[PDB]
Amino acid sequence: RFLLKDGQLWLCAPQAKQIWKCLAENAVYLCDREACFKWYSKLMGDEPDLDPDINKDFFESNVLQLDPSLLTENGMKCFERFFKAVNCREGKLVAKRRAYMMDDLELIGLDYLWRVVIQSNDDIASRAIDLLKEIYTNLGPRLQVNQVVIHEDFIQSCFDRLKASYDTLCCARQEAVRMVRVLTVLREYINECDSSLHPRYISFLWQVADLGSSLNMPPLRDGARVLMKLMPPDSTTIEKLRAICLDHAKLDSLFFGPSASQVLYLTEVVYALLMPSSDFQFHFLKSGGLPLVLSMLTRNNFLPNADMETRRGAYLNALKIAKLLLTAIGYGYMPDICVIRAIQKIIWASGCGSLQLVFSPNEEITKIYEKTNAGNEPDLEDEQVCCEALEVMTLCFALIPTALDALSKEKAWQTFIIDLLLHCHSKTVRQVAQEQFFLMC
Numbered sequence: 001r002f003l004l005k006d007g008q009l010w011l012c013a014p015q016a017k018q019i020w021k022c023l024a025e026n027a028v029y030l031c032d033r034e035a036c037f038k039w040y041s042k043l044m045g046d047e048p049d050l051d052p053d054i055n056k057d058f059f060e061s062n063v064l065q066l067d068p069s070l071l072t073e074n075g076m077k078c079f080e081r082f083f084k085a086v087n088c089r090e091g092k093l094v095a096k097r098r099a100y101m102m103d104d105l106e107l108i109g110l111d112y113l114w115r116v117v118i119q120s121n122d123d124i125a126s127r128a129i130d131l132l133k134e135i136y137t138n139l140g141p142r143l144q145v146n147q148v149v150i151h152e153d154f155i156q157s158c159f160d161r162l163k164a165s166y167d168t169l170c171c172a173r174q175e176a177v178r179m180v181r182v183l184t185v186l187r188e189y190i191n192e193c194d195s196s197l198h199p200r201y202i203s204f205l206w207q208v209a210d211l212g213s214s215l216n217m218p219p220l221r222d223g224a225r226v227l228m229k230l231m232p233p234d235s236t237t238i239e240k241l242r243a244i245c246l247d248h249a250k251l252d253s254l255f256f257g258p259s260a261s262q263v264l265y266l267t268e269v270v271y272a273l274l275m276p277s278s279d280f281q282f283h284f285l286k287s288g289g290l291p292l293v294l295s296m297l298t299r300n301n302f303l304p305n306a307d308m309e310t311r312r313g314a315y316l317n318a319l320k321i322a323k324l325l326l327t328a329i330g331y332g333y334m335p336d337i338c339v340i341r342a343i344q345k346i347i348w349a350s351g352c353g354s355l356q357l358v359f360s361p362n363e364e365i366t367k368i369y370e371k372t373n374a375g376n377e378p379d380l381e382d383e384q385v386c387c388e389a390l391e392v393m394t395l396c397f398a399l400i401p402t403a404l405d406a407l408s409k410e411k412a413w414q415t416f417i418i419d420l421l422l423h424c425h426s427k428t429v430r431q432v433a434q435e436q437f438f439l440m441c
Contacts, residue, residue: 001041003233006050010220011043011050016058025062030072037074044081048157052089060108068124076127083109083131094140103137105150114161117181120254155201156191158182163204169211176217180207183223190230193302199236202228202265209261213307221309224261233269241270242280248267248287253295260303260310267317271291274324285325291334294324298342300359312355312385315346319388326395335396337403343393344416351424353378366415369423378426386420386429390436397440404440 003084004011022035048055059082066075084100089092092104096193117128136154143150165178205224212220257263275281296318298303326335348365351359353376357364368376378386397404407413420433 013054016050034074037078040078056086062091068119071124073123080131099138101140102135118178129185133188133192158186178222180219186370187227190320202234206259206262210259228265237269245283245287249283251288258304264313271317271321290325293318294339300341308356316385319392322392335399344388347386347389350378350382351378353382369419383426383429387432390432394436394439
């Protein structure tokens with residue numbers, strides 16, 4: 001390296017092979033590969049030393065032929081510079097100031113840069129995604145009129161890769177990472193776009209989230225849900241609900257679709273429309289709004305095939321709509337006792353961290369309360385599941401004053417306040433528990 005620093009010599013391809021092919025490509029110890037990777041990283045630093053004709057030769061000859069499964073962090077910065085230097089020399093990219101911004105689309109290295117992220121460990125995939133977002137999102141002149149063409153082409157390609165990866169499950173844990181990473185490609189991709197139109201993009205994604213609970217893969221649901229949330233509401237779905245609401249103004253199956261996850265997204269859509277759109281509240285309450293929200297909360301077959309976060313995610317969203325429904329109708333009767341028994345049962349398990357037991361005989365929920373190994377801590381999201389649940393209970397009791405009168409007699413509605421004020425934890429829930437008990441008083 002030091003000899004080839006100021007001697008003005010060009011590292012010819014023949015000797016470039018033997019230092020490459022026979023040294024690290026066929027090695028024994030991992031440090032042997034580490035040595036060659038970093039040595040290349042400094043060698044091509046900011047100025048070529050093999051001359052561009054060899055640079056376009058040996059990088060595309062066997063450097064790209066390296067197995068992505070055996071590649072480390074040092075393999076990234078050399079690989080990135082190869083993408084930057086080789087592409088900008090032929091006229092496929094431009095260095096510009098720092099970021100080698102896009103000029104062509106059929107890049108010589110994009111063929112296996114997808115392979116690098118699809119088949120690697122956690123750190124390598126992140127860097128590969130970092131490079132994909134760096135090149136794809138950053139677009140400049142001479143294609144600046146073609147955002148739709150480039151962005152849609154990128155989106156459809158991943159969806160095809162997602163769909164191709166999807167059908168394999170129907171190595172299962174390995175392919176599960178493939179969906180996680182290909183979605184991981186998608187999520188930061190749209191991040192720089194801000195700084196979709198196809199209904200199929202969510203319809204397929206609906207089944208994707210359900211498959212996450214089919215094998216109980218946590219990040220799959222997380223990946224799909226974050227992707228949907230960081231995605232402006234689907235045009236087809238938003239018009240469909242208001243059309244049926246308008247149709248019923250002059251729907252039960254809409255929110256009770258057999259697919260589990262799509263219920264969560266549809267509930268998310270309505271609440272987003274309701275909160276700041278002024279007319280949708282009137283249409284929703286008129287057709288079936290308040291009767292449905294209580295029915296979907298008081299029923300056991302609301303989502304029989306529900307994962308832990310899916311059902312509570314269905315809950316935490318549903319109760320949010322129940323707020324503005326009751327407040328609007330407050331200025332001026334379906335609510336009854338059976339509705340409350342569910343809502344109290346929601347908070348029962350919610351402050352226990354055991355919403356899965358929200359269909360328990362209610363004696364078990366007491367049992368975990370009395371210092372059961374200190375393992376009933378509510379999650380940072382179970383805290384809300386209690387919070388908007390309590391305030392809804394206050395609004396309903398304002399509508400029906402006599403309902404709370406009968407509740408004092410039973411054993412329930414006595415241990416309920418004791419648990420929510422003494423045996424509960426994570427004070428913020430207990431803060432609203434007492435405070436909302438005061439308003440009803």
